[PDB]
Every structure is written in structure tokens, then in C-alpha cells.
Design a protein around this ligand. Structure first.
Ligand code: ADP
Lengths: 342, 206
């Protein structure tokens, strides 16, 4: 839901300004910030922005996982533009790259999104595919490494946190699904939002926990009290495990297994939902109890884990069902750590 | 240090450059309305609630003598408001004074911002805030100022001075301007730069 995007409007503006500014040469724009700060979220906001669709007609999105190889990237690009990778399945990495460079030289003013860039090595390897055809081309880059950013541009964009107020509004909108918060929970809820310190991911995770918790004053203050002020430690923000655990412990045992099952895949892996359904059935997490067929019960669990926000929707079908899904890399830490204990 | 250095003819105003970039964005729906020619009353007229800031025309005096001070009366909902001192570079959207770097602010939520003192809480960019300060809502009269000699910031609530020992403004070459940040639709403020009597008695306070 684009509706759920909070307070990142001037952020988007200032980024769009830097995209529109610059010479005819290829210009690369790095957005940096710690995991969960909403880099990928902002990238999507700018990608869908009317004025960016206006300036850059040729637009493409690529998720460059820490575990990505360059051959695959070129083949992904070729498939997007031509839809015929037949002849390129045995083409060498240079032949693939030159083939992409051809498409891009014939292609007009273009904008390329590279999501979760992990290294300058990867960047310099990927850059071989892009012609300096001097058409005013731009490349939007999201990364968690300030070094990566500063290598691409000396003045990278530091993604902001949310204000107390912005924190609350996101929490309310996610925790109550477009409905408004009940006044009795307002004080505890605002206290809760504050202790997130304006980290989108922390706020969205805890919304999932609160959804699952009864909308009672006592349960919310329990939470507010248990969320110590400095739970998001700068040493390990990757140790928001306690924030996750709070949401996790609220899940039925059936969903716990399904959720930890995400640990069995590689980090940041793009999972087709219908494939996951069939596998969850195989592992026997989906108990055929009552009327529910296992496929319906599996999709319900999936939809519910999406309701708890713990799983992120990557694509939807024309059905409006979940096409592909992903769990955030910080959530993978928890799934990996906890699933080695259980 | 005890003699007030009044900027009586100071008023809320977007600068030529602020207006340049404000009209560079084709969105009209993101603006505050100014009650001119007074320009002391500001109203949030946007449909959707977001952080929007406005600054004064003149900056603070840069002397080592007397006090800079202004007061703000709050009308409307009076909630999600931030009052303080901002640089001219400060964005007028999606940020509040004190939150923004190099700026200091007092929030309706009850927080002093931009004051790195021992035992403070660290927020987003580990931005230093001091929590537990008096909240403010409709009908309240809030002062913000700086003792130019000691460089200590001054806040007053309905004429009562607040604990600001050790809360210093940095002595940079950059000019700081009075600034207020509104959020909710229907929020109204009126600024006092000395044109009306201050509720905090500067003569019987500093
Ligand atoms: N402005 C925003 N408003 C609402 N939710 C946001 C916003 N920015 C980020 N989020 C949420 O933050 C979560 C994590 O952000 P993500 O883009 O995965 O982090 P990063 O890319 O920095 O690692 C997403 O599920 C998204 O819904």
C-alpha cells in the first residue's frame, strides 16, 4: 500500500532533484542508511513518481543481493527488454554485457534501480553493461555501506529517521489497518512509537505484534514497559531480535514453524509464494484441521504473516494475491538464530 | 546580558530562496497561510498532516550582550508543534526545528532538541534530546530565546522560565532565525517579537 508510506516526501523530492540535475554523462545516486531505515521503500516511492516516469521512460528495478553474480544480472536485464534469453544462455559474460550495452545504446534516457548494493567490486563489474552514450542516464543505488555510497558519489544521501509524530502515524496506520487508534491506547502507543526512535522497520514489526495482542491497556503497557528505551543498540541494530521475539511469541505454533522456515532459504532470496505454499504443505506445518483444505490454510497463514508484517510482499498477481515475497535481512538474522535453537 | 535585544520588526517570512525551491515543487497543498501584513499569525491549511516549518525574516543578534527572546501564543489543536531556532538552510518540510541539525527546539511533545548534555537521550541520528519537559497545547504562551552573553538557551511556559542550565547555542558564523514547525491541520500560532508585552518578565527574570 502506497498509502502507508509516511513522511518521506521531501526526501523523495531532494533525490528527484539530484536525478534531474547533472550532465549528459552517466550519473550514479547512492542512498545510504542502516538496514530497516526504509531505503528500498524510498527507492520504490521515487521509481513510481510521475515526474521520474516523465523524464526517464526507460525504467528498471534490480535487487542485487549480497549473494548475486554478474552473469545472472545481465541475463535478467536481457529477459526484461527482449524476452528471449535463449541465445544468451550460453553467451559469455562479455557477450551478455555487450548485448545489454547494445540494448541501452538503442534505449533512450534510462534509469536503473540497484537494490541493496553490497560492494564497489559488484558496482564496477555491473557498470560494464552501461554505455556512456551521454544521454543523461542515471542509476539509483541503495546500500548499507557508507563506503560503497561515497565511492559512487562523494555527497551521498543519508536517509533520515522519523519524528516522534511520524513514528506514531506509521504505527497507527499499520497496527489498525487504516482504522484509527482507540484513545486509551494512545499514550502507551505514542510511548511505544517514540522508543522506536524513528526506525521504519522497528515500527512496522511492533505493529505486527500489537495486531496479534488484544487491544487492551494492560497488554499494550506490558509491551511499552518491556520495550526498554535503548533496545535498538547501535552495535547490533541486527539485535532487534527482542523486538522481533515480542511479535514472534504472539504467533501460534503453526505460524512459528512456517516463519522460521524462511531460515532454510538463502538470505534476501526472492521466493515465489505458490512455490512456498506447496513446500509448507510438504513440511507438514499446515495441519488439515476442519474444513480448510491445506492450500487455503497455507495461503491464510501467508496472508496472516503478511498482516503481521513479518513477511514483506514483493509482487502481487493480477488476482491481487501474493506473487513473490521476502523477509527483511534483519528478520533473517532472527529466523536463522532462533531456528538453530529450535 | 540582562538587557533585552528586541527584533520588534521581525515577522514570519519565507525567503526568496525558500520561495524559489517551494515553487520549484508544483505542490500548493503543502503551504502555510500567513496573515499579512502583520505576518505574526500562521495557519496550517494543508489537508494531510505533515511537518511544515516557517522562519522569521531577521536572524538573532550576534552580540555578547543582552537577550534575544520571542513568544508564541498557540491556537487551534495546539498539538505536534515545535518552536525554536533554525538555520536558513533548514528544510521547511518533513522536519521540525531542533530535530534538524544545527537547530534547537522545544516540542509540544515535551522535549528539548539539539542539546547534547550528559545523560540525554539519543534519537535517530542519535540526535540528542532531553525528554520530560512540559508539554504545551492550545492557549499556552511559549517563549524561546538565547542569553547572548552566556550563550544559554531560554524557554518559558506561560511566563514561567524552564530549566535550561547548560543548554548552550553554538557560536557559529551562521545566522540562526526564529522558527516554528506545525504538523496538524487547523493549528494556528501568533508570534510576539515585542510588539505586545511578553508574559515572561525579562526585567524580573534576567
Ligand atoms: N516512509 C515510510 N512509511 C512507512 N513505512 C515505511 C517507510 N519507509 C520504510 N517503511 C517500511 O520499512 C520496512 C523496512 O524498510 P526497507 O526498505 O526494507 O529497509 P532498508 O531498505 O533500509 O533495509 C518496510 O516494510 C516498509 O514498509
Amino acid at each position: 500500500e502506497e498509502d502507508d508510506v509516511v513522511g518521506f516526501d521531501d526526501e523523495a523530492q531532494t533525490v528527484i532533484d539530484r536525478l534531474l540535475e547533472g550532465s549528459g554523462d552517466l550519473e550514479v545516486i547512492p542512498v545510504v542508511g542502516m538496514p530497516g531505515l526504509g531505503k528500498t521503500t524510498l527507492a520504490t516511492k521515487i521509481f513510481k513518481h510521475p515526474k521520474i516516469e516523465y523524464e526517464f521512460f526507460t525504467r528498471l528495478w534490480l535487487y542485487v543481493s549480497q549473494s548475486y553474480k554478474t552473469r545472472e544480472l545481465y541475463l535478467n536485464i536481457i529477459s526484461k527488454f527482449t524476452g528471449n534469453t535463449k541465445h544468451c544462455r550460453d553467451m559469455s559474460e562479455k557477450d551478455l554485457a555487450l548485448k545489454v550495452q547494445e540494448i541501452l545504446e538503442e534505449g533512450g534516457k534510462y534509469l536503473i534501480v540497484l537494490d541493496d548494493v553490497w560492494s564497489t567490486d559488484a558496482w564496477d563489474r555491473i557498470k560494464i553493461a552501461f554505455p556512456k552514450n551521454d544521454k543523461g542516464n542515471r542509476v539509483l543505488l541503495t546500500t548499507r555501506d557508507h563506503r560503497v555510497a561515497r565511492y559512487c558519489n562523494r555527497s551521498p544521501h543519508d536517509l533520515k529517521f522519523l519524528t516522534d509524530e511520524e513514528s506514531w502515524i506509521l504505527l497507527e496506520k499499520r497496527a489498525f489497518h487504516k482504522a484509527k487508534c482507540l484513545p486509551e491506547l494512545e499514550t502507551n502507543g505514542k510511548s511505544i512509537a517514540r522508543k522506536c526512535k524513528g526506525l521504519p522497520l522497528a515500527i512496522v514489526v511492533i505493529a505486527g505484534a500489537l495486531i496479534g495482542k488484544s487491544k487492551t491497556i494492560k497488554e499494550w503497557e506490558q509491551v511499552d514497559q518491556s520495550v526498554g528505551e535503548h533496545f535498538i543498540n547501535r552495535d547490533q541494530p541486527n539485535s532487534c531480535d527482542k523486538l522481533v521475539r515480542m511479535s514472534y511469541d504472539v504467533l501460534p505454533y503453526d505460524w512459528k514453524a512456517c516463519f522460521l522456515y524462511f531460515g532454510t532459504f538463502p538470505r534476501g532470496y526472492l521466493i515465489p509464494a505458490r512455490k512456498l505454499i506447496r513446500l509448507w504443505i510438504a513440511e507438514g506445518f499446515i495441519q488439515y484441521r476442519g474444513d480448510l483444505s491445506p492450500e487455503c490454510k497455507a495461503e491464510e497463514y501467508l496472508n496472516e504473516l503478511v498482516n503481521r508484517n513479518l513477511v514483506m510482499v514483493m509482487q502481487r498477481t493480477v488476482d491481487g494475491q501474493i506473487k513473490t515475497c521476502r523477509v527483511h535481512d534483519m528478520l533473517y538474522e532472527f529466523c536463522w538464530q532462533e531456528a538453530t535453537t529450535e | 546580558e540582562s538587557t533585552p535585544v528586541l527584533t520588534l520588526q521581525n515577522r514570519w517570512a519565507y525567503s526568496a530562496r525558500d520561495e524559489k525551491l517551494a515553487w520549484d515543487s508544483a505542490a500548493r497543498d503543502e503551504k502555510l497561510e500567513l496573515t499579512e501584513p502583520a505576518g505574526l499569525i500562521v495557519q496550517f491549511i494543508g489537508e494531510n498532516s505533515k511537518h511544515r516549518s516557517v522562519r522569521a525574516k531577521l536572524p538573532i543578534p550576534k552580540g555578547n550582550s543582552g537577550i534575544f527572546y520571542y513568544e508564541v501564543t498557540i491556537s487551534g489543536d495546539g498539538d505536534a508543534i515545535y518552536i525554536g531556532l533554525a538555520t536558513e538552510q533548514m528544510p521547511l518540510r518533513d522536519t521540525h526545528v531542533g530535530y534538524n541539525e544545527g537547530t534547537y527546539g522545544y516540542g509540544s511533545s515535551g522535549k528539548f532538541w539539539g542539546h547534547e548534555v550528559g545523560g540525554c537521550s539519543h534519537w535517530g541520528n542519535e540526535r540528542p534530546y532531553i525528554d520530560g519537559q512540559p508539554k504545551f497545547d492550545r492557549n499556552n504562551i511559549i517563549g524561546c530565546g538565547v542569553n547572548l552573553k552566556t550563550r544559554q538557551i531560554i524557554y518559558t511556559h506561560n511566563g514561567r522560565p524552564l530549566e535550561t542550565t547548560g543548554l548552550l547555542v553554538a557560536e557559529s558564523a551562521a545566522e540562526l532565525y526564529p522558527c516554528v514547525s506545525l504538523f496538524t491541520s487547523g493549528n494556528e500560532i501568533e508570534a510576539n517579537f515585542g510588539t505586545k508585552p511578553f508574559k515572561f518578565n525579562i526585567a524580573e527574570g534576567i
